[PDB]
């Protein structure tokens, strides 16, 4: 799976209150963040299922 997947959320200078889902390496799901709204890219994804096709496993 992509590098990005072992990754923290990628958060960024997002003061919306959006919620997004990143994939936890450690717990191997993906869990949701508040802080990464304004970004699309890395660890950092608008649903689990996406969160988990890309990432699961990893």
């Known amino acids: 799976?992509?590098?990005f997947?072992?990754?923290p959320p990628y958060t960024g200078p997002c003061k919306a209150?959006?919620?997004r889902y990143?994939?936890?390496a450690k717990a191997g799901?993906?869990?949701t963040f508040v802080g990464g709204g304004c970004?699309?890219?890395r660890?950092?994804?608008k649903?689990?299922?996406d969160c988990m096709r890309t990432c699961g496993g990893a």
Request: charged letters at 30%; one cysteine or more; glycine letters at 0%.
């Open 39 to 41: 970004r699309a890219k």
């Open 47 to 49: 649903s689990a299922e």
């Open 17 to 19: 209150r959006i919620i």
């Open 5 to 7: 997947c072992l990754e």
């Open 22 to 24: 990143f994939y936890n």
């Open 1 to 3: 799976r992509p590098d």
């Open 43 to 45: 660890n950092n994804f």
């Open 29 to 31: 799901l993906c869990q």
